Design a protein around this ligand. Structure first.
Ligand code: PEA
Ligand code: PEA
Ligand code: CU
Ligand code: CU
Ligand code: NA
Ligand code: NA
Lengths: 620, 620
């Protein structure tokens, strides 16, 4: 009976009924987002109200609505008409993916461009790309997608190998109008195929790999109760799923003796953005927010035993709503399992004669999503020693273009005539902290170098300094790999046995943040991505670093507007937002299908325990 | 019959005989180092000469010697008397470990200090620490170790829990003289024990972990021929072992179609150093070079099946010489096995309908070493996609002190009265590069940010720049995480099918380098550690970044003297030296035995292949 339980098919069927009865789900309506709301702060009075938030699109041009529903009470709580010129358009609908291709396929300007390139319109796929906000005044308040074309030689052909460069179109998907067709010149369509299952390309498959068998002859070491509550090796948590964010972790806690100690209240990847660095007008508008614009959870893959997840796997199958409010099960959408992780601790002592070795392991919670050409795995790891780690795995097919004759400073060449524009993959982790409870503070820790002199006569000393972040206006922080900069989240009212505040240290990878010019449209809309670390005071409605409606929003929403409140964060209920990402200069080896590359972050205990928390691990 | 084969017991027995007959191994002699020499450059004329380098110490005060021997020809090639005031002392001998304790145990000044603290001399262990070079003129040319004391309450007690602070002694281990005893004040000896196998400390062991079984029902996928030649998943290499460096990788190559393509000629960890940042005169001299002063290979552990290495393990048992020239087998000293490594590549395509998933794996070559309180695992990883990775795993027991009343800026508190001085663990990887052959160059690659303006009107463009390093004097490089700085090793005379030079990219972790003041003794002796990247022209005798004789050398030897030759490195036979390390502010969780922390680097192909090299991997 947990309030953090997954949404059930029955709850979603009741939401649909409530919306229908209220007159909010007519035939011109589509559900663009549906998700359970987290319990409010201080629900410890026991009063379960299962509430759902719904974004409702209207395919006839009427104003969309934001609606909150209580399945517990069977009522509509609020329903607001949205002015989308003001607050942003709703997320892209799956059914709009093919509308862009179909509308262009009858437009004379589009047919004119394809005819000059001798392309059969029935072979031309059109990627449905988010539009952003640029110079085009006619787009304000309209639902616009932009289309870039790729040729499929036959139904099983990889279209990404055949970009049609020098051509882009803009489409109003509600009025079904093609607003602009821009043809800047003919580029040869790259001819080589990129079919990575074609024996002519792969050659004979390897016969040298032989099997690795990972089994757990006595089950797994974790238990799952109430559908989504995990207990594993003193860890406790709830695994949630949201159609926008994907896997969400709730109530991460560690059982230290007889005390259950909270660490993180809610952990999610709350936004991601892929900005492209090609200045060609064909692509210079291209930045897609996979989380905020497309909703990564609704494209989660069904994960296959032995291929996607290997070992003794426990699956979760989350339920989401389709565009009409029917429940849709994502079969085997979340994989969970434990993994051997090498040596945990080891010492052979010359004086005591004792040899000691212990092995480590980790709990893995993962899902995969596919949005167009790109595929990402999201992995959360819990380790025996208290460490928490997130890892994103990027794979799929790189987004392509022509490679210009005479080269390019912003595109790399992958095959004859075929290019891949430079781009970044930037994530925002939202960590609603609860280190031993909700009274937390953040300190920035830098290494301090000391000069040779009095008190340091051999010039060997070095130290560290910690700076408390006391107000939101000073809590927008940059990495500094030079000085070993980390951030410590501590509880000043909870001390370890040495009388020091208990804490956790965040270790970043220190990769570059957003490279775009600070005056650009993307720097305004993805402002979170320009800094490595933000800290805010918790608030119910401050969910996403980019705001609630990312699609076609003019910018400034989210983190820069939250922190302007300049709230007290020194020993308060706080949220850490960590930006981290990959800067991708594509290489030949990324083609025709890209080997996984990774990025992430980790948190390690910092005086949270009174000694090593893994002294009670047995000797295998 | 490979020239890169491991040394055999028979070869070492012949070396001993040759040395004995030549009069070089009398009863006052000790072998401080013995190791096989790599074949000279251009031995492709086929002429095997197995040669060994030997450092010979004299326990009676005579001058040590460096000797080269050919077991092939049964002769002494050269024998040089060493002036150790000039070129450095020989590495610490294992038999000198207990000489420091035994000599102090009869010194009246030492007994005076223990008596005032009411310590029974039979309970006091003395750590044998390398001396470095500081202000003491009487030490030049003498073989000095310094001693710090720890109390063992009973034979199985962990002495590290009971440091005797405020007390240090210096010992001449050849003349058997205690040169100085420094007592700066009495500190309480910390009373809590740190016995991590005591049920009173651990509590009841966990009963919740249940087994993970990793098996390979058909063997392993790699083959071992000639004792130490590995073939695995198109990779080819030789696994060497040296008593100073430990595991060395030779002739790393990748079978691309019908061509065997070299990548790295020799890879090793050529030095490591642990500098302490406590300005107390009791410890301000403390910096130990585990590789150069103590020789990490001779302390390699015998690795246990199921505890140290899990799965289907193939072992190597390298042979080294003891101090008298007898062969000594390190049973099960090197573990090798392959490991599942998650998803390699994955894409589900919306237009072609093809779902594609492939799994990754890695080849692991590892050993563990223990020198006093510290334990390290060295791991080399080869991946299916051409990636090479090194990982160091640091564990064991932290070096301790008293925690001063009133605190400290350079020591953290681990238990009542017990401190752990700040320190670093810094490694030097020596990578004798051979990217498609020996004509290589290094480029530094930085991200380039571009301003909004003409040619970049939306302010989204970004680029990269590469700077060729042409001469040694310009090849001393610093990290820059901000700008995503990496280094590319390429072969300008070997091009991929796109006509670009083939290459590999080095990705660093960008951790802080040496923090000590640049005018300090350690900055002079560990000059390699002050910069992230060095490139030299290959030379036979340029083996270690610190020089051949690190112990008590006054500084400047090694890399700073090599690069002063200012040799051409633009398309030549070059060696990359990468500094990387951990800065350790010890935490409570590191006590009484430290959970593993890690650091390393990786190299990934950068246009080395003509497309993804893993298209021929099967579907499991
Ligand atoms: N990831 C969102 C961008 C996208 C969407 C659909 C096809 C190709 C690219
Ligand atoms: N790691 C070399 C320093 C050392 C050597 C022996 C005991 C304790 C410390
Ligand atoms: Cu990418
Ligand atoms: Cu350390
Ligand atoms: Na919080
Ligand atoms: Na070389």
């Amino acid at each position: 009976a947990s309030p953090f339980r997954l949404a059930s098919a029955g709850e979603i069927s009741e939401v649909q009924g409530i919306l229908r009865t209220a007159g909010l789900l007519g035939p011109e309506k589509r559900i663009a987002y549906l998700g359970v709301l987290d319990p409010a702060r201080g629900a410890g009075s026991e009063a379960e109200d299962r509430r759902f938030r719904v974004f409702i699109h209207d395919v006839s041009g009427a104003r969309p609505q934001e609606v909150t529903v209580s399945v517990t009470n069977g009522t509509v709580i609020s329903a607001v008409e949205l002015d989308t010129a003001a607050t942003g358009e709703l997320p892209v609908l799956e059914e709009e993916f093919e509308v862009v291709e179909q509308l262009l396929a009858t437009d004379e300007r589009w047919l004119k461009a394809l005819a000059a390139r001798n392309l059969d319109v029935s072979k031309v796929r059109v990627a449905p790309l988010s539009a952003g906000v640029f110079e085009y005044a006619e787009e304000r308040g309209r639902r616009i997608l932009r289309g870039l074309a790729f040729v499929q030689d036959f139904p099983e052909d990889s279209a990404w190998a055949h970009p049609v460069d020098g051509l882009v179109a803009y489409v109003d998907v509600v009025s079904k109008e093609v607003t602009r067709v821009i043809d800047t010149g003919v580029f040869p369509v790259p001819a080589e195929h990129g079919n990575y299952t074609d024996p002519e390309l792969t050659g004979p498959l390897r016969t040298t790999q032989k099997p690795i068998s990972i089994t757990q002859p006595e089950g797994p070491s974790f238990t799952v109760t109430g559908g989504n509550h995990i207990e594993w090796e003193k860890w406790s948590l709830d695994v949630g799923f949201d159609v926008r964010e994907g896997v969400v972790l709730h109530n991460i806690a560690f059982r230290d003796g007889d005390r259950l100690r909270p660490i993180i209240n809610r952990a999610s990847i709350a936004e991601m953005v892929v900005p492209y660095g090609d200045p060609s007008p064909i692509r210079s508008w291209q930045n897609y927010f996979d989380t905020g614009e497309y909703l990564v959870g609704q494209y989660a893959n069904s994960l296959e035993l032995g291929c996607d997840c290997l070992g003794d796997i426990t699956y979760l199958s989350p339920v989401i709503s389709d565009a009409f409010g029917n429940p849709r099960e994502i079969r085997n959408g979340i994989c969970m399992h434990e993994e051997d992780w090498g040596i945990l601790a080891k010492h052979s002592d010359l004086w005591s004669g004792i040899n000691y070795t212990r092995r480590n392991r980790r709990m893995v919670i993962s899902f995969f999503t596919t949005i167009g050409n790109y595929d990402y795995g999201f992995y959360w790891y819990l380790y025996l020693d208290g460490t928490i780690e997130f890892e994103a795995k990027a794979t799929g097919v790189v987004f392509t273009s022509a490679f210009p004759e005479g080269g390019s400073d912003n595109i790399s060449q992958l095959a004859p005539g075929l290019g891949a524009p430079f781009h970044q993959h930037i994530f925002s982790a939202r960590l609603d902290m609860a280190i031993d409870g909700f009274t937390n503070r953040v300190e920035e820790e830098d290494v301090v170098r000391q000069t040779m002199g009095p008190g340091n006569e051999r010039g060997n000393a070095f130290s560290r300094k910690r700076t408390v972040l006391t107000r939101e206006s000073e809590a927008v922080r940059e990495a500094d790999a030079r000085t070993g900069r980390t951030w410590i989240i501590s509880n000043p009212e909870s001390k370890n046995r040495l009388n020091e505040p208990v804490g956790y240290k965040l270790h970043a990878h220190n990769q570059p943040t957003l490279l775009a010019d600070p005056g650009s449209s993307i720097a305004r809309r993805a402002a979170f991505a320009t800094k490595d670390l933000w800290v805010t005071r918790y608030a119910d409605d401050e969910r996403y670093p980019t705001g609630d409606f990312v699609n076609q929003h003019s910018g400034g929403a989210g983190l820069p507007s939250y922190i302007a409140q300049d709230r007290d964060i020194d020993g308060q209920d706080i949220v850490v937002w960590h930006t981290f990402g990959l800067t991708h200069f594509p290489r030949v080896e990324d083609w025709p299908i890209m080997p996984v590359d990774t990025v992430g972050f980790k948190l390690r205990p910092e005086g949270f325990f009174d000694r090593s928390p893994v002294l009670d691990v047995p000797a295998n």
